[PDB]
Structure 1
Amino acid sequence: XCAIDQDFLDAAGILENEAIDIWNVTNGKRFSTYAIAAERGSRIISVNGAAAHCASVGDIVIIASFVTMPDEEARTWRPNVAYFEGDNEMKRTAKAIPVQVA
């Protein structure tokens, strides 16, 4: 695979060549690949090669990366979250997910 605008990689803290998980809200498919860079500012999310069996143009996805660390640091870790709407317009960046309440 997935080529991603470099600005979006930066906002989520994802590296070129890093393992990523892709979760497709449109069709429910879940797969793992690695990040390819796309030109900064292009807004590209390009599902390439064998991964193109798992998504179509226009599908809405979540792209995640995972890291390991000791238990003590994990308890205070803050993930790099970036939120998109419309044609890949970045709405917000944050460092936490809220608590879901009843």
Structure 2
Amino acid sequence: XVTVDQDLLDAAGILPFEQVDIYDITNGARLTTYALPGERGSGVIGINGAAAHLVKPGDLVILVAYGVFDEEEARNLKPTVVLVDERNRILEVRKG
């Protein structure tokens, strides 16, 4: 895979090549793939590969990244949530 505007990756704190899950709000699909850096500022969210069977252009989705934490760090984690508009421009970022 999924090409993502790198601006979004930066805001999310998701690295290129990191595994991500895609949960489709439009149709309910759920899958696992990875992120690829996309043109900055383009707002690109491109589904490459087999995933195209499940996630279509125009779909609303949620891209989630999970990490492996130690107990202490887990308890102090404040996840990052990036909210975007219909063009995938950042509206707000929440933490925790």
Is the TM-score greater than 0.5? Answer: yes
Cα distance in 2 for partners of 1:47, 1:15 equals 17
Instruction: After TM superposition, list the pairs within 5 Å mapping 1:33-48 onto structure 2.
Output: 33-48=33-48
Provide the residue aligned with 1:50 in structure 2. Answer: 50
Correspondences of 1:1-102 after superposition (within 5 Å): 1-96=1-96
% of aligned pairs identical?
46
Post-superposition offset of 1:82: 0.5
Q: Kindly provide the amino acid, as one letter, of the partner of residue 41 in structure 2.
A: G
In structure 1, stretches of 5+ residues that fail to align are 97-102
Read off the aligned partner of 1:60 and give its amino acid letter: L
Q: Secondary structure at the match of 1:28?
A: coil
Q: What SS does the corresponding residue of 1:57 show, helix, strand or coil?
A: coil
Report SS of the residue matched to 2:14. Answer: coil
Shift of 1:42: 1.0
Shift of residue 90, structure 1, vs aligned partner: 1.1
Instruction: Determine which structure has more spread, i.e. the larger CA radius of gyration.
Output: 1
Q: What do you get for the CA RMSD once the two structures are aligned?
A: 0.8
Structure 1 runs of 4+ aligned residues shifted over 2 Å read none
CA distance in 2, matches of 1:70, 1:87: 36
TM-score, reference length from structure 2: 0.96
What count of residue pairs does the alignment treat as equivalent? 96
> How many Å apart are 1:89 and its aligned residue?
2.1
